[PDB]
Structures are given as structure tokens and as C-alpha cells.
Amino acid sequence: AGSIPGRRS
Amino acid sequence: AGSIPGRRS
Amino acid sequence: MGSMERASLIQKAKLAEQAERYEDMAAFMKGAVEKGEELSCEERNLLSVAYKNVVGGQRAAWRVLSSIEQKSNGPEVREYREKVETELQGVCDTVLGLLDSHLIKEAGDAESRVFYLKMKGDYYRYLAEVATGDDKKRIIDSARSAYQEAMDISKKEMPPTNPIRLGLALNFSVFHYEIANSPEEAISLAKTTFDEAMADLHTLSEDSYKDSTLIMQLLRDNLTLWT
Amino acid sequence: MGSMERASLIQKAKLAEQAERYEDMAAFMKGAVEKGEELSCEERNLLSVAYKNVVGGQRAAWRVLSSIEQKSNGPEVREYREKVETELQGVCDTVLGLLDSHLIKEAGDAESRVFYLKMKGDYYRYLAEVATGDDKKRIIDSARSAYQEAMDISKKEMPPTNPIRLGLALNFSVFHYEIANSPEEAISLAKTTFDEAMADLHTLSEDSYKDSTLIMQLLRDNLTLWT
Numbered sequence: 001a002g003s004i005p006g007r008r009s
Numbered sequence: 010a011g012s013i014p015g016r017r018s
Numbered sequence: 019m020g021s022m023e024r025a026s027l028i029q030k031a032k033l034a035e036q037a038e039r040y041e042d043m044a045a046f047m048k049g050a051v052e053k054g055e056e057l058s059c060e061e062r063n064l065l066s067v068a069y070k071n072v073v074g075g076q077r078a079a080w081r082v083l084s085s086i087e088q089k090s091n092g093p094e095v096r097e098y099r100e101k102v103e104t105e106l107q108g109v110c111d112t113v114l115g116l117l118d119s120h121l122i123k124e125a126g127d128a129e130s131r132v133f134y135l136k137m138k139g140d141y142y143r144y145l146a147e148v149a150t151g152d153d154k155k156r157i158i159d160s161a162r163s164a165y166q167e168a169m170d171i172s173k174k175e176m177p178p179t180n181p182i183r184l185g186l187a188l189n190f191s192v193f194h195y196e197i198a199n200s201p202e203e204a205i206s207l208a209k210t211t212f213d214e215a216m217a218d219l220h221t222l223s224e225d226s227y228k229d230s231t232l233i234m235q236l237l238r239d240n241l242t243l244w245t
Numbered sequence: 246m247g248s249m250e251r252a253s254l255i256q257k258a259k260l261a262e263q264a265e266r267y268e269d270m271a272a273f274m275k276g277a278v279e280k281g282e283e284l285s286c287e288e289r290n291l292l293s294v295a296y297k298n299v300v301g302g303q304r305a306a307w308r309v310l311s312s313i314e315q316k317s318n319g320p321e322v323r324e325y326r327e328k329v330e331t332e333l334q335g336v337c338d339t340v341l342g343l344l345d346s347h348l349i350k351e352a353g354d355a356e357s358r359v360f361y362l363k364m365k366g367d368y369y370r371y372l373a374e375v376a377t378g379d380d381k382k383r384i385i386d387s388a389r390s391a392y393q394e395a396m397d398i399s400k401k402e403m404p405p406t407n408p409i410r411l412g413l414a415l416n417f418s419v420f421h422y423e424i425a426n427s428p429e430e431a432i433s434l435a436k437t438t439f440d441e442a443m444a445d446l447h448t449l450s451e452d453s454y455k456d457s458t459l460i461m462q463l464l465r466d467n468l469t470l471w472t
């Protein structure tokens with residue numbers, strides 16, 4: 001189950 | 010140009 | 019970072035992101051927040067990306083060590099898992115401290131307030147992932163309360179396709195499924211969020227359409243995994 | 246790490262590798278070395294893998310920042326490149342200090358002595374990558390001298406297919422090509438190393454054959470890039 005990746009920008 | 014990776018084990 | 023200019027901290031945060039030096043990036047953005055001024059949209063994203071990467075590495079390591087520890091059940095595996103766990107909790111506490119002093123109370127616009135409250139829910143969720151007892155219930159309720167206030171504002175003040183609103187609903191649905199033992203609530207929220215966004219896509223430009231449909235695909239991916 | 250048992254440090258280094266926590270892994274292995282006992286073959290590999298990953302991240306970040314700095318030619322990019330550069334130099338100095346106090350002087354067997362001297366050449370090579378003047382020439386000579394002593398021992402004491410001997414020759418050839426401005430020496434060393442290993446492969450078991458041919462492929466890859 002994926003949360004927002006939010007690792008870029 | 011690659012040296013030995015040597016990043017595992 | 020008290021002796022460095024706010025603008026230099028922001029510039030160096032962007033450089034650290036390019037260098038994939040996320041610990042540095044987080045320290046720079048922490049220094050920028052502590053200058054006491056509100057953060058722009060771009061600056062909020064830099065703060066979020068920095069700490070998400072830092073705690074993301076800690077969570078991944080904690081899961082590896084927790085899995086090894088469960089298979090074993092000397093003190094070394096437990097001790098090292100505890101060390102990583104304490105470091106993760108310290109980073110979460112640092113982020114929560116920044117939101118509480120004083121990002122959230124100065125955030126008046128919907129876009130900033132929802133952003134920070136979603137962050138608050140996320141980092142309490144990360145604390146809940148490693149919590150066990152006496153505090154797990156209160157930590158879970160702290161996450162739920164932050165997410166819920168963010169939801170209430172986003173439903174009142176943002177269109178259903180707003181990427182912040184969509185990402186908040188995505189993460190709240192993950193909270194329901196993974197933390198709160200409420201998979202039906204998780205599925206219902208993801209479905210209703212997706213359907214209401216789909217009906218609003220006709221209002222968007224080409225670029226906004228791409229932004230919103232990307233996050234709707236993440237909701238769809240979860241529904242596919244959960245059903 | 247003075248209060249932790251040597252065996253616990255080794256165990257935790259292995260756990261940190263599984264968790265991809267290479268900074269921790271390096272600190273654990275540094276503590277193990279400072280216990281003062283010689284290192285086993287496995288323990289040497291753990292020390293090497295830990296610091297190779299740490300400095301590998303620093304070198305990658307330094308290259309990103311150095312490239313941005315060259316394109317610009319405020320002080321921020323230079324300042325941040327300098328900060329990363331100083332941190333990289335500190336890690337190299339730490340490794341070189343461990344080899345000098347007292348890994349190398351207690352290493353009597355060919356397998357341990359060549360291993361440590363190759364390390365010494367590698368970390369002086371990393372220092373040379375970021376050095377400019379007054380010291381770059383002396384740093385380059387320090388790398389060359391370490392590699393050369395390792396070569397001399399490995400040619401006398403190891404078969405041409407020994408993975409340590411092959412990896413030493415590979416890295417010395419990279420030193421010649423990238424640091425010493427001697428591409429013909431780099432190509433000649435890589436070719437002679439490959440050919441002499443090929444002629445010795447018939448002596449090896451199935452598993453040793455796989456170990457040696459893997460490194461010979463790395464020599465071949467470089468020759469393909471250089472010719």
C-alpha cells in the first residue's frame with residue numbers, strides 16, 4: 001500500500 | 010572507467 | 019544554521035537535493051524554518067521532500083531490522099533496532115516541533131494549512147508504525163486528528179482535483195488501512211476521492227490534468243491492492 | 246565504540262549492511278579495528294564495504310556540486326562543495342589513519358597486506374580526485390607508492406587469478422588513467438592483467454572461476470571504454 005512518494009522536487 | 014564496485018558483502 | 023542567510027539556506031537545500039544529500043537538505047530547511055518567516059509553496063515542498071527522504075531511509079532500515087528481530091524470536095539485533103528506532107523518533111519529533119513552532123499557527127491559507135496538517139498526520143503515522151503500548155493509541159489519535167482537520171479544510175476550500183487534497187486523501191486512506199485497522203474506511207475514502215476527482219478533470223488545463231491524474235493512479239493502485 | 250564488545254560490533258556491522266546503513270556500518274567497523282586485534286578475511290571485507298559506500302556517496306555528491314560550480318564560472322555553490330569536500334577528506338583521513346594505526350604494520354600474510362595496501366592506494370586516490378595544488382602531486386605519489394607495493398607483493402605471492410590481485414590491478418589501472426594522466430600505462434596494465442588471468446583459469450574450481458571471470462570482465466569493460 002503506497003503513500004505519496006514525495007521524494008522528488 | 011570503473012574501479013571495483015566493492016559496495017556489497 | 020543561525021548565522022546563514024535564509025536565502026542561502028534555501029539555495030543550499032536545492033543543491034543538496036541535486037546531490038541527493040537529504041540529511042543536509044533537511045538541516046538547511048530546518049534552519050530556514052527557524053528564521054521565523056512563513057514558507058512559500060516551493061519552500062514547503064523542499065521541507066517536505068528533505069524530511070520524507072530522511073525518515074524514508076530510517077523506516078526502511080527499521081523494517082529490515084524488525085524483520086530480522088522477529089525471525090530470531092544475543093541482544094544485538096534488538097539493541098540496533100532500538101537505536102534506529104530512537105533516531106527515527108527523533109526526526110519525527112523534530113518535524114512535529116517545526117510544525118508546532120510555529121508553522122501551523124501562522125498558516126492561514128488553505129494550501130499552506132492543509133499542507134502542514136497533512137505533514138503532521140504523516141509524521142505521527144510514522145511514529146505509530148514503531149509504537150507499541152501506553153502511547154500507540156494516543157499517537158494514532160494524534161495522526162487521525164491532524165488528518166481529519168486537513169480533510170475538513172480541503173473539502174471546504176479546494177477543488178476535488180487539487181493535488182494537495184488528493185495526496186492528503188491518499189495518505190489518510192493508507193493511515194486507515196495500515197495503522198487504524200479500518201480497511202473498509204480506507205477503500206471507501208480512496209474510491210470516493212478518485213470518483214470525485216474524475217468528475218472534476220474536465221475543468222483542468224493539460225498540465226494540471228497530468229498532475230491530478232498521476233495521484234489518482236496512486237489511489238487506483240491501492241484500491242487494486244486492497245480489493 | 247569502546248564500551249561495545251568486538252563481536253557485537255562485527256554483528257552490528259553485518260546488520261547495518263543489511264539495512265543499508267553504511268555510516269553506522271563504518272562506525273561499527275572502525276570500533277572493531279580500534280579493539281587492536283587483526284581482522285579476518287570477512288572482517289576486512291566488512292571494513293572495506295562500509296567505507297566504500299560512505300565515500301562513494303560523498304564522491305557522487307562532490308561531482309554533482311563541482312559540475313554546478315564549473316557551470317557558474319553567490320558563494321553558496323562553492324561553500325557547499327567545500328563542505329562536502331571537507332567531509333570526504335575527513336573520511337579518507339579516518340580510513341588512512343586506521344591503516345596506519347595499525348592494520349598495515351601488523352599484516353604479514355600476502356592476502357591481508359595486499360588488501361590493506363590496495364585500500365591505502367584507493368583512499369589516497371579519492372583524496373587526489375579533489376586535490377588541486379601544493380599537495381596534489383604528493384597525494385598522487387602516495388597513492389602510486391601504496392599501489393606499487395601492493396602490486397609487487399601480489400605478483401610474488403598470489404596467482405594471476407586471485408580476486409584481490411585482479412581488483413588491485415583494476416584500480417591501479419584506473420589510477421593511471423584517471424589520476425596520473427597515463428592512459429597507455431592503464432591500458433597496458435589492464436591488458437597484461439587480463440591475459441595472464443585468462444591463462445590461469447584452467448586451474449580453478451567452478452566457484453573460483455566465477456569470482457575471477459567477474460573481475461576480468463571489469464578489466465575488459467575498461468579496455469573497451471579506453472580503446
Ligand SMILES: *Cc1ccc(C(=O)Nc2ccn(C)n2)cc1
Pocket residue numbers: 004006136181182184185186229233
Ligand atoms: C502530499 C503530496 C505530496 C506531493 C504531491 C504532488 O505531487 N503535488 C503536485 C504535483 C504537481 N503540482 C503542481 N503539485 C501531492 C500531495
Ligand SMILES: *Cc1ccc(C(=O)Nc2ccn(C)n2)cc1
Pocket residue numbers: 013015363408409411412413456460
Ligand atoms: C578490491 C577488490 C574488492 C572486491 C573483490 C572481490 O569481489 N573479491 C572476491 C569475490 C569472490 N571472492 C571469494 N573474493 C576483489 C577486489
Ligand SMILES: [Cl-]
Pocket residue numbers: 097098101257
Ligand atoms: Cl547499537
Ligand SMILES: [Cl-]
Pocket residue numbers: 030324325328
Ligand atoms: Cl555550506
